[PDB]
Amino acid sequence: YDTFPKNFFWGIGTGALQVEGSWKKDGKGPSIWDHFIHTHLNGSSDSYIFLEKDLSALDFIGVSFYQFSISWPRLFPDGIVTVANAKGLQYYSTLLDALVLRNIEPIVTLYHWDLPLALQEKYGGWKNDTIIDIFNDYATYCFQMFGDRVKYWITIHNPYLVAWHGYGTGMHAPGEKGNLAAVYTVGHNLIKAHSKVWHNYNTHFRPHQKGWLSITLGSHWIEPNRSENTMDIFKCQQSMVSVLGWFANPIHGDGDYPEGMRKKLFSVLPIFSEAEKHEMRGTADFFAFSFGPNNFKPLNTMAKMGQNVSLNLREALNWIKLEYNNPRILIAENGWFTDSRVKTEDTTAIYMMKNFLSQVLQAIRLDEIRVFGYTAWSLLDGFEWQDAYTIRRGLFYVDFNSKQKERKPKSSAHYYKQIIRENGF
Amino acid sequence: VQLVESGGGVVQPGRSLRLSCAASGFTFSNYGIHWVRQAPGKGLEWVAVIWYDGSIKYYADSVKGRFTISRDNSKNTLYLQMNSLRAEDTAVYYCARDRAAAGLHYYYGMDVWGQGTTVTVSSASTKGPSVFPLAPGTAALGCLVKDYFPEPVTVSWNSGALTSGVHTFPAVLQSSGLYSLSSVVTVPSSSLGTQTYICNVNHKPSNTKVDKKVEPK
Amino acid sequence: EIVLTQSPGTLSLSPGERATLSCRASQSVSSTYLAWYQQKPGQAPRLLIYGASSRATGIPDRFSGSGSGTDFTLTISRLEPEDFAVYYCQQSGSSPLTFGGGTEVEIKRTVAAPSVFIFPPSDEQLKSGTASVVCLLNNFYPREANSQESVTEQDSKDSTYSLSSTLTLSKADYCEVTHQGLSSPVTK
Ligand SMILES: *[C@@H]1O[C@H](CO)[C@@H](O)[C@H](O)[C@H]1NC(C)=O
Ligand SMILES: *[C@@H]1O[C@H](CO)[C@@H](O)[C@H](O)[C@H]1NC(C)=O
């Protein structure tokens, strides 16, 4: 009962921008976040130069899998896929080689919010539909280069935030704000880019490689203000559809946006053609779900419809099961954060992990939901977007002030290691 | 590499029956096993699945809560325990191995299948068949097998030494709840009276062997 | 749940022809979870294709798989005698896992007319207290033609069916056939 099922995929994850550092190094092009940090707000975890140290941390914890992201501007400084930066290509190939040697399966994310600055300047980034084809070129290059030792792929990490914080609130790069059409045009392009990459993979790479490709959709959970009030519940459903349903319906559903959304955003939300509806759907090989701090904080992140934000991971999983025909689910990101001043005794992180892991096991055994994997979020402390170093998400502690930047396991790291050994608690 | 379905038979409507499947030639505990059933004349219908350690089980709606899938890895056996049976449950049950082995990240598929085990759900008793002849450029003659249960009936002609032209038909189930079929052959009209036609009907359940000779009238 | 609907129910083609089988799902599913199966009369199913397009072990190149979202297609480029059977699509993407109706690929041939032979009941059966009258159609094509019926499988040798309808009258008693091959209805 308390132990997880046999053959359960345990893993940890990171993002390129958060941990890599070396933003100028070896001919890497600047990203929109690079520009954003200089304009609106070092070296972080220095993973680029301390790759061996990260691998030791992975070894220590005992994870069966590792999720990282490839920096698009580190491969192609100008965005366009012509001649890749050879030093950057070796780093990601070395990492994959490193992981295969220690039987650790990689999950590779093509896009973790670091759009090359060149593309944003020249075309307006995800506002232009031109970059759908450029993104496909980038994805194509990656499947050719890394696909023989990669079985798991994620095209875009949390497209909701990319579109909403990037163009709705301005809290994320590129910092655009005040045009709701831009928000939804960006979401349209993100969805289309993902579908095109999936079709590309399915046709050209799947027969030889036989991998699994998805998109990581993040969300929050909401509970009614009055437990039985049906109107409250209806408002909750709207909140869920506004975040999760926006991308999940086109991709895991009928190929079109939620009906509620189409009425509400009549002259703003773009229209999918009938041909497009067929091509958008069925383009994810699993349901990659993100349930973390990015979808809960700050309070302008989501529309609550005046209801109660909730951290019920179990209920969220049931929502996916009911709305999206009970799919296989991988927890693409899960965890919480601590204050920067908390170094190694992160008791809250252990509680949080224990809280969340118990809910996942509940969902498998009691609710018959096919969650086959779990990615604990943040291998090491890094640069947490607008929050920078004010918060900490890692299992391993990193002193940014120190030149050495050694990875020091926290209580959560020892706990997660324990959890994997016992495959439960 | 094989799977063997066992425990099939006859069950009174509403009564309970247990099935078993035996596996050999591969590491049993590394695979998930399905149960798939097929009613006579109908399509494949998924029943249930069990995975590697035996703790994870999924079922189809139609059979949900009545059937219980289980496995014993030390014994290399998987079981399907079915209760509160109905007429619709009368079908052939297969155990199928799923290709998606542990730690492999393979796509799902049922690659290894067993021969099957037939389960009939009825309250009638084991009664042997009655054989009545069907009398005749070419001409036809036959044998009619009537009022037998259960389903398995074997028909031959002249102890197996006549087959070209033979058309043994699949059984049909009549209002009484018993099975009936006919076996027919077509031979040269001139041949009659120069050749002796004997139809062999074997029904192992009723331990009844009948050799019938068919004459024209 | 995901309902898979197969079309057409029956496909009639000659050997060396291309066959195109279709499978539609009520809800969208990843190609990764779609499999095709082949089943011959009296045999257990055989896995042909897994993950929408991948051929199973020992499966020849003539079999292809494709499709995405709600539409999937099985294609046999050049039909062979061994190929004629029934095909089922299956999906594991959603739980519960489901199978399609099935598509039967039969052998198309020159229209052949049936031979009708009617057999009146035997004496022993008559004595018993029940009477069965049997109408039999021999070697005809196609199949499309109280009484209960029974039809055989497509003949390996001449690619035809045979059907036997049985009428079960009472203790005291006291057969028109219609088919394309026949210019006019044949009564016996
Ligand atoms: C996007 O850039 C392309 C290339 O210059 C141009 O043709 C198009 O009009 C631009 N569209 C937007 C939306 O900026
Ligand atoms: C909402 O949930 C909070 C925190 O769990 C709880 O304290 C509060 O009473 C709830 N409010 C309503 C209106 O349900």
Residue numbers in the entry:
A (entry chain A): 78 to 118, 125 to 508
B (entry chain H): 2 to 137, 145 to 225
C (entry chain L): 1 to 145, 159 to 187, 195 to 208
Show the paper's wording.
We determined the crystal structure of β-Klotho KL1 domain in complex with 39F7 Fab. There are two KL1–39F7 Fab complexes in the asymmetric unit arranged in a head-to-head conformation. For each KL1 domain, the N-terminal residues from 52 to 77 and a loop between residues 119 and 124 are disordered. We observed partial glycan density for two of the sites, i.e. N211 and N391. The KL1 domain adopts a classical (β/α)8 TIM barrel fold with eight β-strands forming the inside of the barrel and eight helices forming the outside layer. The corresponding residue in KL1 is an asparagine Asn-241 that would be expected to abolish enzymatic activity. Antibody 39F7 interacts with KL1 extensively with the CDR loops from both heavy chain and light chain, including CDRL1, CDRL2, CDRL3, CDRH2, and CDRH3. The epitope on the KL1 domain consists of residues from three surface loops, including loops α5/β6, α6/β7, and α7/β8, and residues from helices α4 and α7. At the center of the interface, Trp-295 of KL1 sits in a hydrophobic pocket formed by the side chains of His-106, Tyr-107, Tyr-108, and Tyr-109 of CDRH3, and Tyr-33 of CDRL1. 39F7 Fab engages the KL1 domain from the opposite side of the FGF21 C-terminal peptide-binding site.
